[PDB]
Amino acid sequence: PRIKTRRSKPAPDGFEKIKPTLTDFEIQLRDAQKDKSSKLAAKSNEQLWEIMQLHHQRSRYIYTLYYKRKAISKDLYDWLIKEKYADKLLIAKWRKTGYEKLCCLRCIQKNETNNGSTCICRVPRAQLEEEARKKGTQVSFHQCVHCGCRGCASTD
């Protein structure tokens, strides 16, 4: 979230009920962002994957509060969005059929992949398994490179 300044309106009614959870997310992100001297490239990437996961989880929590549980008012939701507590573009994808579990927006940026495809993590696990067993090899896909997503198709 963005720093509090004269531009910031007071947190709407109900913020204090959710604030402890948002503070735990903040603490986790505050530690993940640190420099940890990871020697290996693989571990280095996995440390950015933790940040992408935490960002997703915080937005997912707020999304569940507003759209699924109706536990917060629209004024609070709009404030959380304005204050960058939740990613509105990612929540916008979660509201669309077939994207209800999208890990991140980067995994659907077709323009940035070599083949113009989405990230492999969008493919339903059943289709990868069928292709692999037909081919006679195990499923080689484990975690995608942009974020450590292991599969985010709505069916999985």
Contacts with RNA, residue ranges (CB under 7 A):
39-42, 97-101, 112-115, 117-124, 127-128, 131, 140-141, 144-146, 153-155
Stretch that binds Zn ion, among 6-14, 24-32, 130-138, 147-155 (CB under 5 A): 147-155
129 binds, among RNA, Zn ion, none (CB under 5 to 8 A by kind): none
Stretch that binds Zn ion, among 38-46, 64-72, 117-125, 127-135 (CB under 5 A): 117-125
118 binds, among RNA, Zn ion, none (CB under 5 to 8 A by kind): RNA
Draw the binding track, 77-116, toward Zn ion (x: CB under 5 A; -: no contact): --------------------------xx--x---------
What is the chain's Cα-based Rg? 18
Q: By C-alpha distance, which of 125, 112, 134, 117 is closest to 154? A: 125
Nearest distance, CB of residue 64 and RNA, angstroms? 11
How many CB atoms lie under 10 A from the CB of residue 150? 13
- Nearest residue (CB) to RNA, 33 versus 118: 118
Residue 98 gets which letter from DSSP? T
Q: Which residues contact 105 (CB under 8 A, 6 or more apart)?
A: 89, 90, 93
Distance (Å) of CA 42 to CA 46, 47, 48, 143, 144: 6, 9, 10, 11, 12
- Nearest residue (CB) to RNA, 13 versus 46: 46
Dihedral sign for Cα atoms in the order 26, 91, 68, 151: negative
